Amino acid sequence: AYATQGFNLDDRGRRIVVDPVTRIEGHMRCEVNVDANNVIRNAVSTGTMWRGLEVILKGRDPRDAWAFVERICGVCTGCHALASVRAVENALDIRIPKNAHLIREIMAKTLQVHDHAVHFYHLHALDWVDVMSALKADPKRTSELQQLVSPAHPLSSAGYFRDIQNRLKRFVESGQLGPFMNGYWGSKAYVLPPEANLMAVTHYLEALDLQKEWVKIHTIFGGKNPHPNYLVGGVPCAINLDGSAPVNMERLSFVKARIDEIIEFNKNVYVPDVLAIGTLYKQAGWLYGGGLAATNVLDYGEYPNVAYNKSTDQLPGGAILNGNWDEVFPVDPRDSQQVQEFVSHSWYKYADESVGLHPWDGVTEPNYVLGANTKGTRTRIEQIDESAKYSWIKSPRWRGHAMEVGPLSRYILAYAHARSGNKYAERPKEQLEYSAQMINSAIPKALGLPETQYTLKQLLPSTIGRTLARALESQYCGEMMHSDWHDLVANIRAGDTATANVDKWDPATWPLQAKGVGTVAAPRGALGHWIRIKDGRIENYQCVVPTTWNGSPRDYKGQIGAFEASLMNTPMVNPEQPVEILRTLHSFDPCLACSTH
Amino acid sequence: PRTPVLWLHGLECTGCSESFIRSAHPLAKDVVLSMISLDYDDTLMAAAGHQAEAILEEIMTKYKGNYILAVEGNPPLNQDGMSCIIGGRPFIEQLKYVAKDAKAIISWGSCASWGCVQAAKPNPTQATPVHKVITDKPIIKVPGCPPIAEVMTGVITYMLTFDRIPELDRQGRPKMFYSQRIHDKCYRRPHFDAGQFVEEWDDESARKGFCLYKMGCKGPTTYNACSTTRWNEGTSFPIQSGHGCIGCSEDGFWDKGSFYDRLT
Numbered sequence: 001a002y003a004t005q006g007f008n009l010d011d012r013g014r015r016i017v018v019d020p021v022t023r024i025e026g027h028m029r030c031e032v033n034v035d036a037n038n039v040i041r042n043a044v045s046t047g048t049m050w051r052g053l054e055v056i057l058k059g060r061d062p063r064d065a066w067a068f069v070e071r072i073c074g075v076c077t078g079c080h081a082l083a084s085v086r087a088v089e090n091a092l093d094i095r096i097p098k099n100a101h102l103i104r105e106i107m108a109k110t111l112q113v114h115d116h117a118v119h120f121y122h123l124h125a126l127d128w129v130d131v132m133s134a135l136k137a138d139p140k141r142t143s144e145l146q147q148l149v150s151p152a153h154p155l156s157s158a159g160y161f162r163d164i165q166n167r168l169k170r171f172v173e174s175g176q177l178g179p180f181m182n183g184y185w186g187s188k189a190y191v192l193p194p195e196a197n198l199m200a201v202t203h204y205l206e207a208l209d210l211q212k213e214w215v216k217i218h219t220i221f222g223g224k225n226p227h228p229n230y231l232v233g234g235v236p237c238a239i240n241l242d243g244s245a246p247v248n249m250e251r252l253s254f255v256k257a258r259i260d261e262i263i264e265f266n267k268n269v270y271v272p273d274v275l276a277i278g279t280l281y282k283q284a285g286w287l288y289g290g291g292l293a294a295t296n297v298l299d300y301g302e303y304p305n306v307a308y309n310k311s312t313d314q315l316p317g318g319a320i321l322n323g324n325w326d327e328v329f330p331v332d333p334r335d336s337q338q339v340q341e342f343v344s345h346s347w348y349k350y351a352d353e354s355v356g357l358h359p360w361d362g363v364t365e366p367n368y369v370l371g372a373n374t375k376g377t378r379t380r381i382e383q384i385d386e387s388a389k390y391s392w393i394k395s396p397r398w399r400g401h402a403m404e405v406g407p408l409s410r411y412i413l414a415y416a417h418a419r420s421g422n423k424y425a426e427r428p429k430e431q432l433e434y435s436a437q438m439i440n441s442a443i444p445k446a447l448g449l450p451e452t453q454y455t456l457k458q459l460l461p462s463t464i465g466r467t468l469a470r471a472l473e474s475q476y477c478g479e480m481m482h483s484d485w486h487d488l489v490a491n492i493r494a495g496d497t498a499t500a501n502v503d504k505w506d507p508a509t510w511p512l513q514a515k516g517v518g519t520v521a522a523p524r525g526a527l528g529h530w531i532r533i534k535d536g537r538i539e540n541y542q543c544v545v546p547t548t549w550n551g552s553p554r555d556y557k558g559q560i561g562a563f564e565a566s567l568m569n570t571p572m573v574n575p576e577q578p579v580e581i582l583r584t585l586h587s588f589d590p591c592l593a594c595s596t597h
Numbered sequence: 598p599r600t601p602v603l604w605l606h607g608l609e610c611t612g613c614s615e616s617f618i619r620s621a622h623p624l625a626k627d628v629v630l631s632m633i634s635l636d637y638d639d640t641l642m643a644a645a646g647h648q649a650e651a652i653l654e655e656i657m658t659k660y661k662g663n664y665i666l667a668v669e670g671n672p673p674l675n676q677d678g679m680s681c682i683i684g685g686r687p688f689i690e691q692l693k694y695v696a697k698d699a700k701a702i703i704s705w706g707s708c709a710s711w712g713c714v715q716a717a718k719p720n721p722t723q724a725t726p727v728h729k730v731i732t733d734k735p736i737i738k739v740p741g742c743p744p745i746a747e748v749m750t751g752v753i754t755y756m757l758t759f760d761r762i763p764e765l766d767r768q769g770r771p772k773m774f775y776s777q778r779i780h781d782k783c784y785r786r787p788h789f790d791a792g793q794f795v796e797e798w799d800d801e802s803a804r805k806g807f808c809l810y811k812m813g814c815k816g817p818t819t820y821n822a823c824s825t826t827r828w829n830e831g832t833s834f835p836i837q838s839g840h841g842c843i844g845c846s847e848d849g850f851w852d853k854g855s856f857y858d859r860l861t
């Protein structure tokens with residue numbers, strides 16, 4: 001047992017293993033210890049995969065890098081490509097034209113919406129929604145709930161819900177439950193009434209059909225989704241209004257139509273569902289899962305209104321420590337003393353493992369070895385030994401501090417910035433105050449529940465808060481790319497049709513040595529790619545990815561990362577059913593392929 | 598009685614799962630609810646840990662020799678297989694176990710078919726395609742990074758309708774989707790034939806949609822349905838959106854030189 005960051009770790013209680021953690025991208029093992037009352041007193045995050053992209057990239061052409069690193073992840077598809085072209089452009093002093101900037105922003109915001117909405121419905125919802133309970137729902141009462149939760153959503157009739165319910169009934173009655181097989185249905189950890197379960201499952205099916213439409217924006221500008229194409233120096237989707245070309249006004253009109261559909265979905269389906277589910281779980285008292293969000297949050301800051309001008313970031317970033325929302329520290333990805341990665345408890349080796357390496361000096365040499373207190377063997381692990389190396393995920397820290405990253409972090413940072421006079425953060429602030437009023441007062445009043453008085457400071461550092469922030473961010477991203485589209489069309493019509501700067505396409509024009517960094521506010525948090533170029537080739541290429549931050553194992557000082565902290569202090573209804581573990585872990589939207597790369 | 602599908606994940610990026618759920622004809626919703634029984638799939642399944650593991654034995658027993666094994670990703674042979682750990686054991690053990698009683702095996706995408714990005718030089722995990730590990734079962738390769746959504750669901754639809762594996766070429770790919778090179782029906786082919794090429798990004802030629810051969814397009818040596826079926830309900834494909842084909846459906850495409858280096 002030991003104390004760290006206000007958490008009292010104790011591994012003397014009952015040990016529980018969850019492997020595989022499902023409804024995530026990639027591979028994770030989670031172990032916890034619970035006390036005599038089934039409260040989690042220890043949590044262990046193990047990334048159970050590695051591919052070695054950083055090693056594979058060595059000696060290759062920086063212009064090809066984006067395609068390799070894009071394949072780090074097909075869920076957050078393209079965000080690694082964006083980071084990569086930004087890193088190379090930074091190294092080579094390439095400024096991309098305005099249309100390429102706007103097209104990249106639109107692609108980034110499209111990914112945000114798609115990733116967030118699919119995550120909530122298809123990965124997260126079953127932690128909050130009991131599908132078997134939806135079968136018992138009354139269609140008329142479901143209709144009435146729908147109209148209170150979201151008046152503007154036109155799919156609300158009692159007959160529509162009856163049809164959906166009947167299809168689910170027949171599906172379950174077959175004895176082939178498919179993705180619902182061996183679920184935790186009926187657990188007391190589920191609190192929604194049948195009608196809310198039916199409404200949510202209906203929206204699950206709605207979202208499954210609609211999500212394929214949103215990505216057609218990627219298809220227009222990048223040829224395909226998943227894995228749209230990017231380009232060092234700009235975008236490949238050349239523009240010609242009067243021509244035959246990749247982009248004309250009809251293609252841009254198509255993009256606009258998809259954006260408008262996105263805005264309706266976020267406003268009418270996604271945000272209201274999360275507010276309603278959040279309210280009901282708040283009413284049940286399930287405010288667990290805050291972890292590091294209550295103290296330390298970080299993002300690099302993203303979406304500048306004016307290209308290459310960070311002061312205009314619409315999701316302004318920085319770092320907060322010790323829960324002090326009155327002081328945002330600037331974060332510099334170039335500073336060797338800020339972002340550093342330890343491997344003390346990871347399956348890698350450094351020359352000196354007592355220190356953290358800035359990614360320009362990063363090292364990735366695998367070292368799969370288990371501690372002496374492991375139960376089992378090297379190829380058949382029963383209980384992992386977290387006193388030694390226990391994960392394929394490195395341990396990123398900021399000036400030695402363990403930080404939570406993600407939409408929640410960005411929304412806390414936005415709120416902090418807006419309080420200190422930053423007008424670029426006005427919209428996220430408005431969203432948060434609106435959400436708090438809905439969760440505390442308006443939704444309870446509508447559903448006949450008592451009103452509460454939680455402040456944002458109390459409400460946001462929680463699994464509910466983390467889930468809320470993701471939905472709000474999706475909404476905000478949809479709104480922003482709507483404006484980006486207008487700016488793009490305006491620029492084109494003003495006579496600027498440029499999509500690529502090719503001045504430094506040829507390696508003969510490059511400095512013989514160079515380094516660069518590209519950052520992105522990816523769906524799951526702070527993403528950075530750091531590159532060293534030598535004689536036209538990749539000398540070093542290091543990625544520090546949002547789930548690397550969140551899912552990290554312990555550092556040299558024994559400090560815990562966001563996943564492990566979030567599970568602490570959480571009661572379990574049944575220690576053999578990982579409902580609460582999944583609910584909180586999923587609120588981070590873990591991408592394990594990303595985390596390990 | 599819907600055919601059970603046990604969808605395993607090895608080393609992968611999950612782009613193949615994502616592509617599958619983009620299908621418009623048929624809708625993935627309809628595939629899952631009305632066509633197959635998707636009984637194991639990490640991305641979507643309710644159960645985790647021990648409860649998830651228990652599904653495998655149950656389906657394998659009840660539907661012995663009558664379930665489809667779908668594999669996304671691949672097994673690593675280095676690190677004693679523990680660069681991909683499932684249930685505290687190497688993924689390769691899960692793969693071999695589930696494969697033994699499968700009616701058919703689908704290798705989704707370039708990862709399962711050939712190795713894909715993790716198998717590119719120097720392949721630190723010794724990531725290995727499914728057919729080099731499972732050597733005693735019929736395997737259909739559905740390559741691409743990822744494959745087209747309708748190609749993936751098209752394979753499933755054929756298999757469910759006929760209870761047979763579609764006709765395969767010598768590399769194990771379904772002829773119904775991989776018989777044509779991108780270059781055969783590419784809409785830029787008239788430009789290629791007229792010697793009309795892009796030389797630099799966003800030159801006048803690029804703005805008129807000229808052929809991308811000199812920008813590295815690998816369409817002439819790449820077999821896929823991208824020029825005809827196209828992507829995301831026929832919205833576009835790489836070449837239409839202005840980037841050359843990078844050869845993503847072909848074995849070892851990551852190690853055939855820069856994507857921007859032209860074919861000779």
Ligand code: SF4
Pocket residue numbers: 779780781783784785786787789807808809810814815816817836841842
């Ligand atoms: S763009 Fe590529 S596939 Fe199309 S005609 Fe040219 S070389 Fe062939």
Ligand code: F3S
Pocket residue numbers: 224741742779819820821823834835836841842843844845846
């Ligand atoms: S890159 Fe791949 S998606 Fe088609 S156009 Fe070439 S095979």
Ligand SMILES: [Cl-]
Pocket residue numbers: 086101104
């Ligand atoms: Cl950019």
Ligand SMILES: [Cl-]
Pocket residue numbers: 707711712713714847848849850851
């Ligand atoms: Cl390959």
Ligand SMILES: [Cl-]
Pocket residue numbers: 236237238795798799803838839840
């Ligand atoms: Cl082009």
Ligand SMILES: [Mg+2]
Pocket residue numbers: 054394542543544545597
């Ligand atoms: Mg890394």
